[PDB]
Amino acid sequence: HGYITFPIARQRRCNVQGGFWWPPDGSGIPDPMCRAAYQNVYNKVLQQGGTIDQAASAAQYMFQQDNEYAALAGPNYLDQNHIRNNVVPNYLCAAHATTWRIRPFGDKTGMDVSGSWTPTVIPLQDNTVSTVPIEFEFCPTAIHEPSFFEIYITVPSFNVYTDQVTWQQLINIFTGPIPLVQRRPDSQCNANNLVYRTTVGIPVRQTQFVLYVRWQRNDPVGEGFYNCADVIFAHRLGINEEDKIRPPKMKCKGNDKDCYHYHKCERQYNTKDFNYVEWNDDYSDYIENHTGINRDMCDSTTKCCYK
Amino acid sequence: HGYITFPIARQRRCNVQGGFWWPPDGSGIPDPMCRAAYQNVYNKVLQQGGTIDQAASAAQYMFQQDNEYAALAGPNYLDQNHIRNNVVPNYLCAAHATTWRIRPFGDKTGMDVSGSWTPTVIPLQDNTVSTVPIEFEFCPTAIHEPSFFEIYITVPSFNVYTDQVTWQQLINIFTGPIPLVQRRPDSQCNANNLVYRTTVGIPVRQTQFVLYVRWQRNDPVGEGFYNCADVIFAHRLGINEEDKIRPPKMKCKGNDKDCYHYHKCERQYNTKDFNYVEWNDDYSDYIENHTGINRDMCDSTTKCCYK
Ligand SMILES: [Cu+2]
Ligand SMILES: [Cu+2]
Ligand SMILES: [Cu+2]
Ligand SMILES: [Cu+2]
């Protein structure tokens, strides 16, 4: 049993943020996607004749069981067609848990809804880099060996706002065993002394993307843990350095001088010759009145009457 | 002569925002990309032996001449290979003005640097829409007819932070004459009573993109105006509606009630069971210490000495 602590898995973040224990309808969950996830399972059970308690039980079970986003593969766990067609054919972020009445693995399908899932924001120091090394940290709440990991990235055409994660959309970037190592004092995992850590060069994405992590046990039961991790690269601001023309080393003079281990934690855009704040509020109204299917076309200039 | 007023052209926004008249080194320009653009031309002239005045003249000429981002095609203006190989082969956002000593069209190459160019933010009401209708508004400061427009969009693999705009990266979405119409009272153009307005269904992009607008005169001189427009679609937040399970219509009772024409202009994420602000500041440090080429690997746990 376990989950991704870095980059934090989708269900791990929903669990740690809380607000899901009470009120039972999940209205106390601050993150909107964690809330939708919860309320989808809650409303599903309500539709299927479950009581408020069975509905709040099924939804809280999805959040609480963040170390058990699992599926059993059996002894045939290396058979890729059996994983993709039988073990986890769909509901990948839920590790294919679709039955609220049956535990394990209950119903975790709420974790597969699409929308503005909160990502791990990784900043870019150079916007031209092809890959970004990420040191993954998988938190084992229960120690299991022998085992192996599989790390996937979504294809560049994936859209987290509208799409469900599918195998046809995932690119394998890591396959193999990850040895168990002692957690660092700064570890995001607080279960036991051990973690799984590995460095993966993550292909740079210009959009929010998903990292798929499968932790598979090499054993006849074939239990595997499947977790989705929402990530985004933040671009560096300013000119791309490779285009920056630097001035020659110069020494100037004249009566007018304007002629020549801790870090830091819109009226700035106004100048003496332009009021940006006023213009940009009018420019925002322009965007609203002149974009979309309901934009102004003729009504502001055309009058009509029935003959 | 003219420029795009909606979505505002890259050079039009740099001109209207000001701060470029004084100090002459462009240090008074608030937008970082408008500043880099200016300072690239200023530093180019300085490198080529120009004085501070010739350098400040060439850079201010680029900003001031926002209605003259032009190139002459001659009588062969419908010959696409002649436009792309002879008239505007490169420096597309500058309309191929590369000579600071020669006016027209001077040097406007600063407008073709890559980086965090400020876009026109168009919000999405539905993240599943394929196209967004935009009502373009081209501001003619000088009236010319006969003429035609060409509107292009960058391919989805374009990256404004690193790439120069090329014809091999542009997709034609509009070709033809746009009739001259009376400006609306809310017009972004303040030159004369007339504007060019057209509706284009803009293919949705998940990234910041460029809109290329060519205004070509049908005449033996063959003067055309070429402008880049930086745009981005803002995604709607929350669950994708097509995945939202709604509860059945219910009427509940019990002693515990928690069991059941003008618009509006992080401690919110904390709950009674979790302190988000503290966790997320530690999570930010984790990202910094465990991503990139300088991440912590062995130094926090390994000690060495020279035998
Ligand atoms: Cu286990
Ligand atoms: Cu420092
Ligand atoms: Cu003109
Ligand atoms: Cu309203």
XYZ file of C-alpha atoms and ligand atoms in Angstrom:
618
model
C 0.000 0.000 0.000
C 1.025 3.516 -0.803
C 0.656 6.624 -2.971
C 2.779 9.267 -4.758
C 4.029 11.984 -2.373
C 6.072 13.752 -5.053
C 4.578 14.922 -7.401
C 1.577 14.457 -4.954
C -1.040 12.030 -6.370
C -4.529 13.407 -7.184
C -6.290 11.339 -4.466
C -3.463 11.881 -1.907
C -3.960 15.693 -2.128
C -7.776 15.295 -1.881
C -7.340 13.204 1.260
C -4.754 15.426 3.069
C -6.695 18.688 2.342
C -9.689 17.313 4.335
C -13.081 18.958 4.845
C -14.603 15.652 3.584
C -15.511 14.079 7.016
C -18.333 16.588 7.699
C -20.883 17.866 6.321
C -21.602 14.394 4.743
C -22.485 15.976 1.298
C -18.805 17.105 0.903
C -19.703 20.844 0.874
C -16.789 21.448 3.317
C -14.126 20.374 0.764
C -12.242 23.586 -0.264
C -10.703 22.328 -3.614
C -13.477 22.362 -6.361
C -12.275 19.175 -8.137
C -11.770 17.232 -4.862
C -15.365 18.354 -4.028
C -16.813 17.285 -7.477
C -15.003 13.917 -7.122
C -16.557 13.364 -3.681
C -20.038 14.637 -4.709
C -20.063 12.469 -7.873
C -19.722 9.286 -5.753
C -22.145 10.685 -3.083
C -24.769 11.554 -5.786
C -24.212 8.159 -7.596
C -25.112 6.182 -4.404
C -28.082 8.519 -3.746
C -29.350 7.806 -7.367
C -28.906 4.016 -6.804
C -31.122 4.081 -3.664
C -28.400 4.381 -1.023
C -29.068 6.415 2.158
C -27.140 9.644 3.110
C -24.870 7.448 5.342
C -24.153 4.817 2.615
C -23.497 7.775 0.163
C -21.215 9.651 2.655
C -19.536 6.270 3.467
C -18.779 5.467 -0.242
C -17.429 9.005 -0.940
C -15.314 9.173 2.295
C -14.042 5.614 1.490
C -12.655 6.969 -1.845
C -10.750 9.786 -0.009
C -9.623 7.740 3.085
C -8.317 4.804 0.942
C -5.669 6.968 -0.792
C -2.998 4.192 -0.152
C -5.341 1.569 -1.758
C -5.978 2.789 -5.312
C -5.374 -0.855 -6.278
C -6.480 -3.560 -8.712
C -5.588 -7.317 -8.681
C -3.800 -8.599 -11.784
C -3.265 -12.218 -10.616
C -0.094 -14.164 -11.642
C -0.227 -12.731 -15.191
C 0.817 -9.182 -14.051
C 3.518 -8.825 -16.850
C 0.851 -9.353 -19.556
C 0.294 -5.742 -20.805
C -2.908 -6.676 -22.753
C -4.349 -8.284 -19.628
C -3.530 -5.032 -17.595
C -5.083 -2.670 -20.164
C -8.105 -4.801 -21.095
C -8.931 -6.669 -17.831
C -7.294 -5.162 -14.759
C -7.441 -1.391 -15.475
C -9.349 -1.001 -18.836
C -10.822 2.379 -17.808
C -11.225 4.577 -14.668
C -7.371 4.707 -14.505
C -7.150 7.439 -11.851
C -9.549 5.265 -9.688
C -7.435 2.092 -10.486
C -10.787 0.730 -11.933
C -12.764 0.717 -8.601
C -16.360 1.049 -9.879
C -18.586 -0.813 -7.338
C -19.653 1.164 -4.214
C -21.399 -1.938 -2.698
C -18.238 -4.117 -2.977
C -15.075 -3.450 -0.806
C -12.331 -3.886 -1.934
C -12.093 -1.762 -3.967
C -15.369 0.199 -3.658
C -16.098 3.129 -6.024
C -13.362 5.672 -6.635
C -14.676 6.822 -10.148
C -15.023 10.391 -8.786
C -11.193 10.689 -9.156
C -11.595 10.249 -12.960
C -13.772 13.303 -13.612
C -12.183 15.972 -15.818
C -11.653 19.603 -14.908
C -9.332 22.069 -13.189
C -7.475 19.455 -10.995
C -4.900 21.373 -8.882
C -1.373 20.562 -10.166
C 2.147 20.524 -8.705
C 3.682 23.703 -10.216
C 7.291 23.100 -11.300
C 9.036 26.375 -12.418
C 11.267 26.554 -15.508
C 14.691 28.201 -15.203
C 15.174 28.009 -18.995
C 12.074 27.779 -21.260
C 14.169 25.982 -23.969
C 14.866 22.792 -21.892
C 13.565 19.562 -23.532
C 13.298 17.542 -20.270
C 13.059 18.388 -16.559
C 14.540 15.900 -14.052
C 11.992 15.118 -11.328
C 12.927 13.095 -8.291
C 9.811 10.943 -7.678
C 8.933 9.915 -4.167
C 6.552 7.018 -3.642
C 5.323 6.639 -0.027
C 4.931 2.935 0.982
C 2.537 2.777 3.953
C 3.042 -1.088 3.843
C 6.414 -2.580 2.704
C 6.202 -5.091 -0.194
C 9.018 -6.808 -2.136
C 9.659 -8.074 -4.871
C 7.989 -5.217 -6.879
C 8.475 -2.855 -9.823
C 7.311 0.574 -10.982
C 5.960 1.913 -14.248
C 5.848 5.693 -14.802
C 3.825 7.174 -17.681
C 3.246 10.664 -19.009
C 0.167 11.829 -20.949
C 0.657 12.513 -24.736
C 0.988 16.283 -25.544
C -2.635 16.402 -26.952
C -4.172 15.436 -23.561
C -6.524 18.021 -22.021
C -7.100 17.478 -18.247
C -10.185 19.800 -18.406
C -12.157 17.499 -20.727
C -10.427 14.097 -21.097
C -10.398 10.877 -19.159
C -6.926 9.332 -18.770
C -6.559 6.296 -21.182
C -3.671 3.924 -21.953
C -3.740 5.168 -25.660
C -2.851 8.623 -24.174
C 0.012 7.499 -21.946
C 3.724 7.315 -22.869
C 5.992 5.030 -20.797
C 9.041 6.949 -19.489
C 10.134 4.552 -16.654
C 9.981 0.727 -16.235
C 11.732 -1.331 -13.528
C 12.407 -1.890 -9.820
C 13.085 1.168 -7.602
C 15.111 0.233 -4.486
C 13.798 1.115 -0.983
C 15.836 3.981 0.580
C 15.702 5.908 3.909
C 13.376 8.940 3.758
C 15.141 12.328 3.929
C 14.244 14.639 6.917
C 12.389 16.860 4.349
C 10.281 13.843 3.102
C 6.668 14.323 2.047
C 6.034 10.706 3.267
C 5.199 10.080 6.964
C 4.425 6.350 7.312
C 7.687 4.510 8.017
C 11.451 5.121 7.622
C 11.370 3.969 3.922
C 10.404 5.518 0.531
C 10.942 4.793 -3.186
C 12.891 7.542 -4.952
C 13.871 7.748 -8.616
C 14.913 10.429 -11.051
C 13.023 10.680 -14.267
C 13.749 13.206 -17.022
C 10.185 14.484 -17.607
C 9.471 15.617 -21.214
C 8.559 19.330 -21.081
C 4.877 20.058 -21.660
C 3.382 23.458 -22.533
C 0.093 22.365 -20.883
C -1.066 20.743 -17.617
C -0.388 17.042 -17.830
C -0.773 13.799 -15.858
C 1.936 11.423 -14.561
C 0.704 7.830 -14.206
C 2.447 5.665 -11.622
C 1.907 1.902 -11.349
C 3.523 0.064 -8.356
C 3.258 -3.696 -9.130
C 4.050 -6.556 -6.713
C 5.881 -9.570 -8.284
C 3.622 -12.184 -6.673
C 0.704 -14.596 -7.566
C -1.915 -12.184 -6.056
C -0.611 -9.547 -8.494
C -1.796 -6.492 -6.564
C -0.786 -3.238 -8.219
C -1.238 0.365 -7.036
C -2.201 2.931 -9.749
C -2.006 6.722 -9.131
C -2.553 9.873 -11.222
C -0.377 12.950 -10.528
C -1.472 16.409 -11.871
C 1.607 18.517 -12.894
C 2.350 21.777 -14.801
C 5.525 23.628 -15.806
C 5.578 27.377 -15.045
C 7.346 29.410 -17.716
C 10.109 31.883 -16.918
C 9.179 35.512 -17.746
C 11.059 37.981 -19.895
C 12.991 37.715 -23.150
C 14.330 34.302 -24.302
C 18.087 34.876 -23.537
C 19.190 33.465 -26.934
C 17.496 36.524 -28.599
C 18.861 39.174 -26.104
C 21.219 41.742 -27.807
C 23.577 43.132 -25.090
C 25.024 46.663 -25.398
C 28.801 47.245 -25.959
C 30.873 48.089 -22.801
C 30.587 51.896 -22.654
C 31.720 54.772 -20.400
C 29.522 57.906 -20.690
C 29.418 61.445 -19.149
C 27.161 64.576 -19.275
C 24.950 66.905 -17.137
C 21.866 64.619 -17.603
C 22.587 61.248 -15.821
C 19.414 59.613 -17.245
C 20.975 59.858 -20.758
C 23.228 56.867 -19.803
C 21.546 32.100 1.882
C 17.914 33.446 2.008
C 15.803 34.591 -0.962
C 12.782 36.880 -1.385
C 9.332 35.617 -0.302
C -1.430 46.392 -12.247
C -0.743 50.066 -11.224
C 2.901 48.925 -11.914
C 1.879 48.849 -15.631
C 0.745 52.564 -15.587
C 3.156 55.161 -16.998
C 3.243 58.994 -17.028
C 1.874 58.850 -20.666
C -0.711 56.000 -20.319
C -3.328 54.876 -17.784
C -3.246 51.047 -18.153
C -5.805 50.318 -15.373
C -8.586 52.336 -17.101
C -7.764 51.064 -20.638
C -7.510 47.388 -19.526
C -10.917 47.495 -17.756
C -12.481 48.764 -21.018
C -10.431 46.130 -22.956
C -11.880 43.366 -20.620
C -15.474 44.587 -21.544
C -14.489 44.528 -25.241
C -13.402 40.843 -24.932
C -16.804 39.997 -23.225
C -18.927 41.879 -25.789
C -17.006 40.741 -28.929
C -15.984 37.108 -28.341
C -18.199 34.001 -28.059
C -21.561 32.856 -29.456
C -23.377 35.734 -27.593
C -21.137 38.625 -28.790
C -22.744 41.887 -29.950
C -23.330 41.817 -33.735
C -26.242 44.051 -34.852
C -28.338 44.986 -31.773
C -26.106 47.914 -30.649
C -26.581 49.566 -34.134
C -29.774 47.984 -35.685
C -33.412 48.794 -34.849
C -36.311 46.665 -36.267
C -40.111 46.600 -36.175
C -42.841 44.162 -37.297
C -44.565 45.521 -40.494
C -1.973 52.367 -42.651
C -3.330 50.676 -39.593
C -3.031 47.954 -36.946
C -5.161 45.349 -35.113
C -7.183 46.878 -32.249
C -8.954 43.613 -31.419
C -7.253 41.303 -30.482
C -4.693 44.192 -29.931
C -1.550 43.729 -32.087
C 1.796 43.138 -30.303
C 3.328 46.464 -31.465
C 0.048 48.415 -30.943
C 0.029 47.436 -27.219
C 3.760 48.304 -26.886
C 3.081 51.732 -28.374
C -0.072 52.624 -26.332
C 1.484 51.484 -22.983
C 4.246 54.134 -23.400
C 7.227 54.747 -21.119
C 9.401 54.471 -24.286
C 9.906 58.257 -24.982
C 12.179 58.768 -21.932
C 14.723 57.519 -20.517
C 16.195 56.859 -24.048
C 17.435 53.312 -23.032
C 13.758 52.161 -22.665
C 14.107 51.441 -18.903
C 10.754 53.253 -18.359
C 8.760 50.646 -20.356
C 6.650 48.682 -17.785
C 5.917 45.506 -19.918
C 9.097 43.240 -19.929
C 8.690 42.053 -23.560
C 7.900 45.569 -24.891
C 11.096 46.639 -23.016
C 13.264 43.749 -24.460
C 11.917 44.573 -27.960
C 12.904 48.236 -27.556
C 16.295 47.460 -25.915
C 17.183 44.884 -28.614
C 16.930 47.580 -31.338
C 18.623 50.195 -29.046
C 21.531 47.767 -28.269
C 21.789 46.685 -31.993
C 22.385 50.328 -33.127
C 24.832 50.872 -30.222
C 26.803 47.713 -31.388
C 26.810 49.024 -35.015
C 28.409 52.355 -33.957
C 25.251 54.453 -33.635
C 25.054 57.172 -30.939
C 22.551 57.109 -27.976
C 20.259 59.424 -30.063
C 20.413 57.265 -33.256
C 19.784 54.158 -30.990
C 16.857 55.827 -29.097
C 15.559 57.114 -32.499
C 15.587 53.602 -34.124
C 13.892 51.961 -31.081
C 11.240 54.747 -30.664
C 10.648 54.569 -34.479
C 9.689 50.856 -34.059
C 7.111 51.741 -31.320
C 5.760 55.015 -32.894
C 5.281 53.404 -36.372
C 2.698 50.881 -35.083
C 0.379 51.728 -38.108
C 3.316 51.085 -40.539
C 4.387 47.478 -39.937
C 4.486 47.257 -43.747
C 6.374 45.658 -46.634
C 6.033 46.384 -50.412
C 5.018 43.416 -52.563
C 4.806 45.260 -55.925
C 2.174 44.246 -58.558
C 2.723 40.526 -57.837
C 1.001 40.699 -54.374
C -1.189 37.536 -55.046
C 1.959 35.418 -55.610
C 2.208 33.501 -52.268
C 5.802 32.279 -52.984
C 6.886 35.853 -53.679
C 5.270 36.987 -50.291
C 6.898 34.209 -48.235
C 10.308 34.207 -49.941
C 10.804 37.884 -50.968
C 8.456 40.287 -49.207
C 8.190 38.790 -45.679
C 10.583 35.732 -45.618
C 11.358 36.192 -41.897
C 10.886 38.799 -39.098
C 7.085 38.381 -39.618
C 6.016 40.312 -36.506
C 8.282 43.217 -37.765
C 6.814 42.842 -41.354
C 10.526 42.220 -42.360
C 11.869 45.720 -41.382
C 15.550 44.924 -40.676
C 17.536 48.101 -41.592
C 17.747 50.835 -38.892
C 19.622 53.226 -41.287
C 16.901 52.985 -43.999
C 13.344 54.486 -43.492
C 10.931 53.102 -44.611
C 10.754 50.641 -42.996
C 13.612 50.975 -40.469
C 14.322 48.152 -37.970
C 11.403 46.617 -36.113
C 13.136 43.160 -35.452
C 12.729 43.742 -31.682
C 9.020 42.776 -32.139
C 10.142 39.257 -33.228
C 11.944 38.268 -30.024
C 10.404 35.328 -28.153
C 9.212 35.335 -24.565
C 6.299 36.125 -22.259
C 4.476 38.552 -24.685
C 1.324 39.806 -22.876
C -1.771 38.243 -24.527
C -5.451 39.162 -24.900
C -7.133 36.788 -22.392
C -10.373 35.362 -23.817
C -12.341 33.317 -21.178
C -13.998 29.979 -21.994
C -17.621 29.426 -20.947
C -17.398 25.739 -21.950
C -13.948 24.042 -22.066
C -15.258 21.524 -24.692
C -15.849 24.129 -27.492
C -13.834 23.439 -30.699
C -13.861 27.068 -31.971
C -14.399 30.498 -30.395
C -15.929 33.254 -32.572
C -13.814 36.416 -32.353
C -14.970 39.658 -33.883
C -11.737 41.164 -35.295
C -11.352 44.903 -35.454
C -8.714 46.383 -37.732
C -8.096 50.130 -37.183
C -7.366 51.972 -40.494
C -5.533 55.214 -39.652
C -5.457 55.884 -43.493
C -8.330 54.632 -45.746
C -7.258 52.415 -48.692
C -9.417 50.516 -51.220
C -9.381 48.063 -53.083
C -7.808 45.736 -50.420
C -8.099 42.307 -48.795
C -7.249 40.602 -45.504
C -5.549 37.348 -44.606
C -5.880 36.000 -41.044
C -3.615 33.184 -39.815
C -3.312 31.220 -36.602
C -0.138 29.529 -35.312
C -0.048 25.654 -35.469
C -0.763 24.001 -32.045
C 2.996 23.130 -31.566
C 4.035 26.833 -31.573
C 5.689 28.088 -28.367
C 5.665 31.931 -28.060
C 8.368 31.707 -25.308
C 11.024 30.251 -27.632
C 9.887 30.393 -31.292
C 9.975 32.966 -34.030
C 6.744 33.187 -36.055
C 7.241 31.472 -39.517
C 4.900 30.837 -42.463
C 5.441 26.996 -41.967
C 3.824 27.548 -38.500
C 0.803 29.537 -39.657
C -2.625 28.159 -40.665
C -4.874 30.338 -42.869
C -8.346 30.747 -41.298
C -9.568 33.854 -43.256
C -8.950 35.119 -46.840
C -10.838 37.934 -48.611
C -12.067 41.540 -48.552
C -13.552 42.915 -45.291
C -15.939 45.840 -45.947
C -15.400 49.214 -44.187
C -18.067 49.806 -41.477
C -18.795 52.616 -38.950
C -16.932 52.136 -35.644
C -19.163 51.308 -32.649
C -19.143 53.814 -29.684
C -17.200 51.111 -27.711
C -14.499 50.868 -30.494
C -10.863 50.257 -29.600
C -9.946 52.318 -32.744
C -9.692 56.142 -32.488
C -8.469 57.406 -35.885
C -11.510 58.026 -38.098
C -15.194 56.976 -38.245
C -14.302 53.669 -40.058
C -12.985 50.193 -39.049
C -12.754 46.688 -40.561
C -14.733 44.104 -38.591
C -15.073 40.383 -39.273
C -16.042 37.297 -37.339
C -13.672 34.406 -37.386
C -14.254 31.089 -35.608
C -10.861 30.750 -33.862
C -9.693 27.121 -33.340
C -9.356 26.566 -29.570
C -5.770 26.370 -28.332
C -4.644 24.995 -24.958
C -1.574 27.294 -25.115
C -0.788 30.967 -25.846
C -0.885 31.476 -29.580
C -0.396 34.145 -32.261
C -2.925 35.533 -34.780
C -1.277 36.838 -37.963
C -3.121 39.560 -39.860
C -2.109 40.724 -43.344
C -3.947 43.786 -44.824
C -3.019 43.901 -48.556
C -3.809 46.748 -50.989
C -4.889 45.632 -54.523
C -2.600 48.081 -56.338
C 0.742 48.162 -58.327
C 2.686 49.464 -55.247
C 1.469 46.347 -53.401
C 1.851 47.709 -49.871
C 0.695 45.255 -47.228
C 0.417 45.671 -43.442
C 1.466 42.627 -41.321
C 0.629 42.365 -37.576
C 1.081 39.734 -34.842
C -1.596 39.420 -32.120
C -0.785 37.522 -28.848
C -3.905 35.635 -27.551
C -4.756 32.974 -24.904
C -7.936 31.147 -23.869
C -8.654 31.053 -20.112
C -10.196 27.777 -18.976
C -13.379 27.614 -16.919
C -12.843 26.151 -13.414
C -14.647 23.269 -11.776
C -15.921 19.910 -13.000
C -16.538 19.356 -16.753
C -20.414 19.436 -16.711
C -20.691 16.309 -18.923
C -19.184 14.272 -15.995
C -21.327 15.905 -13.194
C -23.690 13.365 -11.458
C -26.661 15.347 -10.005
C -28.519 14.071 -6.911
C -32.183 12.866 -7.120
C -34.875 15.435 -6.058
C -35.163 14.783 -2.304
C -37.071 16.167 0.708
C -35.323 15.513 4.063
C -35.995 16.240 7.795
C -34.220 15.753 11.190
C -32.772 17.620 14.239
C -29.361 18.109 12.484
C -29.897 20.466 9.448
C -26.324 19.901 8.151
C -27.262 16.234 7.435
C -29.200 17.491 4.337
C -27.852 44.090 -15.084
C -24.527 44.432 -13.122
C -22.112 41.614 -12.221
C -19.419 41.133 -9.563
C -16.069 42.946 -9.967
C -5.018 30.582 0.014
C -6.389 30.667 3.638
C -9.656 29.734 1.764
C -7.997 26.307 1.151
C -7.427 25.697 4.945
C -9.897 23.423 6.756
C -10.520 22.541 10.434
C -8.528 19.256 9.833
C -5.666 20.582 7.603
C -3.402 23.647 7.466
C -2.873 24.119 3.685
C -0.765 27.325 3.968
C 1.961 25.610 6.070
C 1.962 22.357 4.014
C 2.041 24.201 0.636
C 5.034 26.369 1.680
C 6.951 23.164 2.549
C 5.668 21.580 -0.728
C 7.061 24.646 -2.690
C 10.552 23.997 -1.060
C 10.249 20.302 -2.004
C 9.659 21.253 -5.692
C 12.794 23.570 -5.582
C 15.045 20.984 -3.889
C 13.887 17.929 -5.931
C 13.304 19.148 -9.503
C 15.853 20.415 -12.059
C 19.536 19.794 -12.844
C 20.570 21.221 -9.387
C 18.187 19.113 -7.222
C 19.493 17.507 -4.015
C 20.738 13.952 -4.711
C 23.453 12.797 -2.259
C 24.822 15.863 -0.394
C 22.035 15.989 2.259
C 22.874 12.331 3.262
C 26.482 11.633 1.996
C 29.765 12.780 3.579
C 33.140 12.289 1.758
C 36.835 12.931 2.380
C 40.038 12.771 0.290
C 42.086 9.631 1.285
Cu -0.039 -3.053 0.592
Cu 20.349 32.257 -3.884
Cu -1.606 53.613 -45.477
Cu -25.695 38.659 -15.837
